[PDB]
């Protein structure tokens, strides 16, 4: 499975945040509630997709950039990436004011 790094990331409000994981990018809510934020390749037909969640692809190495732009305080929480064609281990983000 992919790595999804760092194991936890802490940033200030308005500061970008990026992880390194078809490729999906979820945030985990309770009771096994999971919502996809962005995906490689981009999902056009996804209702109400949040533009500030980007999943650029690096040159190679199967490297990827899960970037959330201009973070919000409520963006803090539980994030993981998966591959579809197997989860990768849980990497975190907290937002500071």
């Amino acid at each position, epitope marked *: 499975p992919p790595t999804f790094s760092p194991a936890l990331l802490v940033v200030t409000e308005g500061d970008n945040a990026t992880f390194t994981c*078809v490729l999906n990018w979820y945030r985990m809510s309770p009771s096994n*509630q999971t919502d*996809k934020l962005a*995906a490689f390749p981009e999902d056009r*037909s996804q*209702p*109400g997709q949040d533009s500030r969640f980007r999943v650029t692809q690096l040159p190679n190495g199967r490297d990827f950039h899960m970037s959330v732009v201009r973070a919000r305080r409520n963006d803090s929480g539980t994030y993981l990436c998966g591959a*579809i064609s197997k989860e990768s281990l849980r990497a975190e983000l907290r937002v500071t004011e």
Partner: antibody
Amino acid sequence: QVQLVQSGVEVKKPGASVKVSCKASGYTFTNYYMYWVRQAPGQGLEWMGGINPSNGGTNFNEKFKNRVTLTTDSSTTTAYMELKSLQFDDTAVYYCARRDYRFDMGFDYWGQGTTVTVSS
Amino acid sequence: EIVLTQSPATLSLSPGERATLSCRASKGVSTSGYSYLHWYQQKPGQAPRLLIYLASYLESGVPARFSGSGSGTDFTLTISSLEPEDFAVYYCQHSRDLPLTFGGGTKVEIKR
């Protein structure tokens, strides 16, 4: 049990509004996006909009913008389609179709269809 | 905006001959090795039924008699050995961008 069931037939007057329901059962409701397709009698298919039930985000064909409201209810796993200011050319069969939220693998499953007729 | 034009409008063959449908997009519906092109089968008075998704992939439960191919922007739905059920309309639809659109459909008939 991967099957959507839509509400009953509708016969409305021009200028009225109609609210069609689509009840999903037996899959993880928020694990699939809901889309609405219509088809005038003896014609092709026309996409109207899509909704993400996990947060309520929406897609819209611009021909129906500020004329269609798509709502969802997680409790009853039921999506709704409200077409206001009904026109004569809105006479069609209105479908709800689900799509995988992980990636687009096509509208695998469709409702039985709701016939809406606009006339004076 | 993208429009798909299925060529051509109507075909008609006996329950055995090869059926080849075409879907012909206005612009490119393929990106990063994926073509947002699906095929549905609609028999009169019922909801559509998806057969091929993402240009090549076949939907579960659908007989292997159906096959999807083509890429970049050209696509073709291929049916080899037909059965009496197979005569109906077949639509293609793109998800490359918004709004989602469908082809006008191709009706396959029984030639006598």
